[PDB]
Amino acid sequence: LTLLNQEMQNLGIEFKKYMSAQINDVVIGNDREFDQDFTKLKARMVAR
């Protein structure tokens, strides 16, 4: 039972870490797909 509780706490910590890593990857610009979408956004705006 206590091992189950430990596992739940570790799971929560891991989820928080993963979400932070993804958001910061987007922020830094390492997310190539997001960069493609944003450059498409800018090009569409200028063309319009």
The helix (H) or strand (E) run that includes residue 35 is helix 32-47
Query: Does residue 6 interact with other proteins by CB under 8 A?
Result: no
Contact 8, 1 (CB under 8 A): no
Q: 16-45 mask for other proteins (x: CB under 8 A)? A: x--xx--xx-xxx---------x--xx--x
13 binds other proteins (CB under 8 A): yes
How far apart are CB 13 and other proteins at their closest, in Å?
A: 8
| Residues 31/25, Cβ–Cβ less than 8 Å | yes
Contacts of 9 (CB under 8 A, 6+ apart): none
Contact residues for other proteins, defined by CB under 8 A: 12-13, 15-16, 19-20, 23-24, 26-28, 38, 41-42, 45-46
